[PDB]
Every structure is written in C-alpha cells, then in structure tokens.
Amino acid sequence: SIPHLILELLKCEPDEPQVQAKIMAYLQQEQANRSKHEKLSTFGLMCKMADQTLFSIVEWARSSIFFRELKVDDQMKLLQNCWSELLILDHIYRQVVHGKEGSIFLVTGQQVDYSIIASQAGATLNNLMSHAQELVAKLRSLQFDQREFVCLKFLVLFSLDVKNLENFQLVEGVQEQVNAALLDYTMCNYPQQTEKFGQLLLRLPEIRAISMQAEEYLYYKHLNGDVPNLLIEMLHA
C-alpha cells in the first residue's frame, strides 16, 4: 500500500520523456548554430545541459503540492538552497534506473562511456562523479524505487537548513510528514530491509556534500572564465 501523501507527491512528477526530449532538442540546435571553430567544450555542453535541467526543476517545484502555497520569496529561498542537490539527486536516480556499468546516462537520453567522460572532466568532477556512483551502487542494492525517490526530492526541497522563511512552519511540517510517510512506505513495502530507511536518509547528507562541493567547483570555473544563464544566477545567489 502507498500512503496517500506519497500518491500526491507522485502526481506532481514531470513527464520525463517530454523533459528529456526538450533538453535534447535545445542542445542540438545550440550546436547546430555554432560554426566549425566555435563548438562547445564538453564541460560547456554539460553546463548548458544542467542549465536546461534547472528550468524543468523550477517548473516542477512551482506546480508541486505544498510548494505552490508558499509566497514567491519563500519559493526562491528554498530553490536557492537546494537547486544543486536536486540536480545531483536527479542524476543519481537516472543512473539507478537506466545506468549500466561503465557508462553514464545523461538527461538527454544519451548513454556515454565513463572512459570518455573521465578523460575530459578533470580530477574534481571525476571525484564527485565517482562518489555519486558509489551512492548509485548503494541505492541500487537497496532497490531504491520511484516512491522513495519522490520523497527524497521533497525532503531536499523542504530543507530545515533554509532560514528567513515567512512560513517556516509549512517547511517543517512537510519535512516531518514526508519523513513519516517514507518511514511507513519502506516498512510496508520492504519489510525485510530494516536498514533501508536509514540508508536512504544518510544519502541526503552525502548528496548535500557532493552538490555543495559541486557548486563551489562550478563557482571556481565561472570565476576562471570557463562557464557560459540560470545556472550562473543560482550560483551567485
């Protein structure tokens, strides 16, 4: 059985084929416009890929239950606190669902060999990607499913780390009720895995660590002149 609250969360999920198709098409046109001598560095492609993923994340949040009740200033503070976490969580779940050994599945629907990516990404992003893959392997061994994924999305979005909120009580209530719903759901659907609920929660600090370190690296690359938008606005704020 599924707690009704989780059903309401599932109702808010985007149509993932449409999201990926739109991003794939955007990036195709971008490269098409570019002359022979001005193509995008692979790092630059990933930045634009992440940029366009952020647009869909904002659109998802603004239409979601609970979030749509917040005033816009509260909505901005939540997304500014968790945008990078949501990008990483989405990346991780994509590998859990579609990931094969030795390759990375991108939001465009492209499968890319890790040996290609690791050649171009540099030590820092390779480290963060490898740590993310460790979470992928752990989540796949626990049978991380879509109901749990949407719970973690909402726990990331409605973070107690966000200060200066006009309606902090709603954020606290969502955090608490989604927690109780996840606890119940894992207990009913995976009774044998006593460790599952805790192993899910303990990924959130790790995703937080990975995403904040990812933010700091990208801010470095921006300051260094390496980044081309929404991604930059989120970094600064």
């Binding site: 904002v58 816009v72 901005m76 600064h236 704020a237």
Partner: peptide, 11 residues
C-alpha cells in the same frame, strides 16, 4: 535573482 522570480511568476 530576477530570473528565478520571473520563472516562478510568469504565465
């Protein structure tokens, strides 16, 4: 962050 506000306010 005018861009984020716009994405949250736009029709």
């Amino acid at each position: 962050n005018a861009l984020l506000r716009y994405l949250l306010d736009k029709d």
